Amino acid sequence: TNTIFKLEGVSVLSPLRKKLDLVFYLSNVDGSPVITLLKGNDRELSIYQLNKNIKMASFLPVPEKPNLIYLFMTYTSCEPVVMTLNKENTLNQFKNLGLLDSNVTDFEKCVEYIRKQAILTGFKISNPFVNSFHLQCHRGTKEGTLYFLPDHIIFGFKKPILLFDASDIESITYSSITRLTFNASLVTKDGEKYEFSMIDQTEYAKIDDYVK
Asked: What are the PH domain coordinates in residue numbering?
């Protein structure tokens, strides 16, 4: 058929918080890649011409929840997307759609499949954690996750979600050194300042090396 694959009951956090069905198909008009989140039979979100409107996309680990994984993507025109995939469910479905062998146990297989289908349609989804790392910190009062990717830093996923180009970092300065943690402040080349607090001190080495 027209659809390449379909995951049901993916949990979306952004740009809305709601359990939906993800469909990845090619337009019947010009055979272009398309991603749509629908609630049953209603289009809650669509991103057309994915091979053109996708700024970046990748799978990101969910902290302390190995059976879950994030799909994060930023786009241009709609009609950042963040949704958790259940690894087990996604495995059972991909098998039940003949997309993977019934013997396959590893979830990396599901990821590998999706990565390929993405490329065949003309865009790329990353898998940085297959050097990348992530940690917990606070922004003001709200806890969150810093993901250090090869070319990007992400802060997710309470609104607002922050996405830095590693190339766009001017400075980092450390303060508030307690017996367990420290604070760090990213200054972009544009002069914007962002401060992250309550960073475990074991993370200093990886962070400072990343920025240097």
From this structure: 1-125, 131-212
- 131-212 CATH fold: PH-domain like (2.30.29)
Name 126's Cβ contacts closer than 8 Å, sequence gap at least 6.
56, 57, 58, 59, 149
**Inter-residue contact 114 to 125 (CB < 8 Å):** yes
Instruction: Tell me the CATH number for domain 1-130.
Output: 2.30.29.120
User: How is the chain split into domains, by residue range?
Assistant: 1-130, 131-212
Resolution (angstroms) equals 2.6
Number of neighbouring beta carbons within 10 Å of residue 48: 18
Strand partners, 24: 5, 35
Q: Which amino acid is at 15?
A: P
Phi-psi region of 5 (alpha: psi -120 to 50; beta: other; left: phi over 0): beta
In the β-sheet with 162-165, what is the strand arrangement from edge to edge?
162-165, 152-156, 142-148, 133-139, 193-200, 181-188, 169-175
φ/ψ of 90, rounded to 5, equals -60, -35
What is the chain's length? 212
- 59 to each of 25, 81, 85, 110, how far by Cα in Å? 19, 12, 10, 11
Rg of the chain, C-alpha, whole Å: 19
The experimental method is: X-ray
193 close to 185: Cβ distance less than 8 angstroms:
yes
